[PDB]
């Protein structure tokens, strides 16, 4: 197994306040495949200046998906306090065929800081974190959201300048507020901008260290790091699984401005991924420096027939979900 660094030496976990109702907003961003939302590029062959019919894994037209939001944590003036999160860790969802993710759509526009709904701020992109695995259950106090055996964790870090992917056993820790300890509400990750995100010194392990406060990492088969260029550009992220492993897709390298998703990693994860959950993250800022973080949207993939329209440049810029209605079926037959 891989060395993933020392365990947390902290005697306890940070207290976590779950207030789902502050995170239940209707900020609708549904799939529009006529703009090629949520399209993974067909693998094995490229196409150019042509319209084809293709069977693959696609979102359905108009799917609202599931929205997730991250928030600044509690703070009194200069002192951060409890984390502040939604109930995402208890909401385990079925992986099925995988999913695609709309990231940073609201960035640059005016938004709310969540924890203080009247305080407004310019929305900034934030990356989602995921927990995926093949066996789930409950923590000792009965709360849902526990992943057993080897679990895949996708965890951004470094103030959004890297992504970590690792496959380890998650051993819940036993200190106060930890998942096998006293007064457990939810696990969460966090970072502290004042000491984690000044210029030229981004802590590449802030989020990982906060994760290690809730779980000891055991028998880790791999830990991969992917560097991220910093910007406010919206992007798409996807994940599927085949017998060859878990496949990670992004728009960033090949189609940064257009959103087409291409595979950038294959993970040696060969147990069938059946469940996933969104890992809550809370930003430990002081009151006067809270930011607004853009919501991310997850949409499930299913085997569907799409008409795909490729531009001269080779990119998909328009598609048709043929099974949407009778008229769409005939459009796909040209």
């Amino acid at each position, epitope marked *: 197994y891989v060395d993933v660094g020392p365990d947390s030496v*902290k*005697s306890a976990c940070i207290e976590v306040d779950i207030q789902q109702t502050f995170f239940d907003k209707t900020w609708p961003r549904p799939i529009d495949v006529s703009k090629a939302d949520g399209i993974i590029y067909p693998q094995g062959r490229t196409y150019s200046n042509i319209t084809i019919t293709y069977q693959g894994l696609f979102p359905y037209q108009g799917d609202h998906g599931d929205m997730y939001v991250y928030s600044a944590g509690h703070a009194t003036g200069t002192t*951060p306090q409890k984390l502040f999160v939604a109930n995402y860790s208890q909401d385990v969802k079925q992986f099925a065929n995988g999913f695609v993710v709309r990231i940073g759509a609201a960035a640059n526009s005016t938004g709310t800081v969540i924890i203080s709904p009247s305080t407004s701020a310019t929305i900034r992109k934030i990356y989602p974190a995921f927990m995926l695995g093949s066996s789930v259950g409950n923590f000792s*106090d009965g709360k849902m959201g526990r992943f057993f055996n080897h679990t895949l964790v996708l965890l951004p870090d470094g103030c959004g300048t890297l992504l970590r992917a690792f496959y380890c056993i998650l051993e819940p*820790r*036993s*200190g106060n507020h930890c998942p*096998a300890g*006293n007064s457990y509400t939810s696990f969460a990750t966090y970072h502290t901008p004042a000491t984690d995100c000044s210029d030229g010194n981004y802590n590449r392990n802030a989020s990982l260290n906060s994760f290690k406060e809730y779980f000891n990492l055991r028998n880790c088969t791999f830990m991969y790091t992917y560097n991220i260029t910093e910007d406010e550009i919206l992007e798409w992220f996807g994940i599927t699984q085949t017998a060859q492993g878990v496949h990670l897709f992004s728009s960033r390298y090949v189609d940064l401005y257009g959103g087409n998703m291409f595979q950038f990693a294959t993970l040696p994860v060969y147990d069938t991924i059946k469940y996933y959950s969104i890992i809550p993250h809370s930003i430990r800022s002081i009151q006067s420096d809270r930011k607004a973080w853009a919501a991310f949207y997850v949409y499930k993939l299913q085997p569907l027939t799409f008409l795909l329209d490729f531009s001269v440049d080779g990119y998909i810029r328009r598609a048709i979900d043929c099974g949407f209605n009778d008229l769409s079926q005939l459009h796909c037959s040209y």
Partner: antibody
Amino acid sequence: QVQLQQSGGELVKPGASVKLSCKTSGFTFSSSYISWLKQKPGQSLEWIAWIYAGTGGTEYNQKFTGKAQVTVDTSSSTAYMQFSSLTTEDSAIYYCARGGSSFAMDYWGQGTSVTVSS
Amino acid sequence: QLVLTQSPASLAVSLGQRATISCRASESVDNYGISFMNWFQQKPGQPPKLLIHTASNQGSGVPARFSGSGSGTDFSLNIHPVEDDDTAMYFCQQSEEVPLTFGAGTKLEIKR
């Protein structure tokens, strides 16, 4: 009244094992931390391990990993510590205390004397 | 790994006067003002007794003459007015990092 009642002193030869117990009363066992600690005469205290009785979750001093195992029986509000591979350096008084993680140890057992000698 | 150095190793105080024991942690115990620092008294043949927790909060039933203060790396236990039963060992102890560690102890003796 709050009571942590530790088992009687033991003399054991080097290499032997001992199981110390700590029968508790007068407070909610299932929601408290139980810690075990070591003290040699004239010396400060050394924390060995804790267990959260409600879940069985444990945290160990890595100096004692492989030699100490703490368990609880929640039906009798009793904490146990199994000590194995004992050395003459393990001769000391051993305490159970209620406390652990960030909770200060506020109630203490009377102590169990362990002598490791041939 | 987190080391607490107490000062002084011993001290002798007359009845009714102040005793001041200080504890310095090698790294910072504080988390934005709240420090998991405890103080204990131990008399001969007895288990320790909790005096102070979280730096400055008194244990249940602990006489008001024992008081704790400090933050970050520096803490102190003040005993005033000192009484004859206060002759004992005093230990600081941190509960912020694993392994939990104690100071080496300060012996308080009463002058007569």
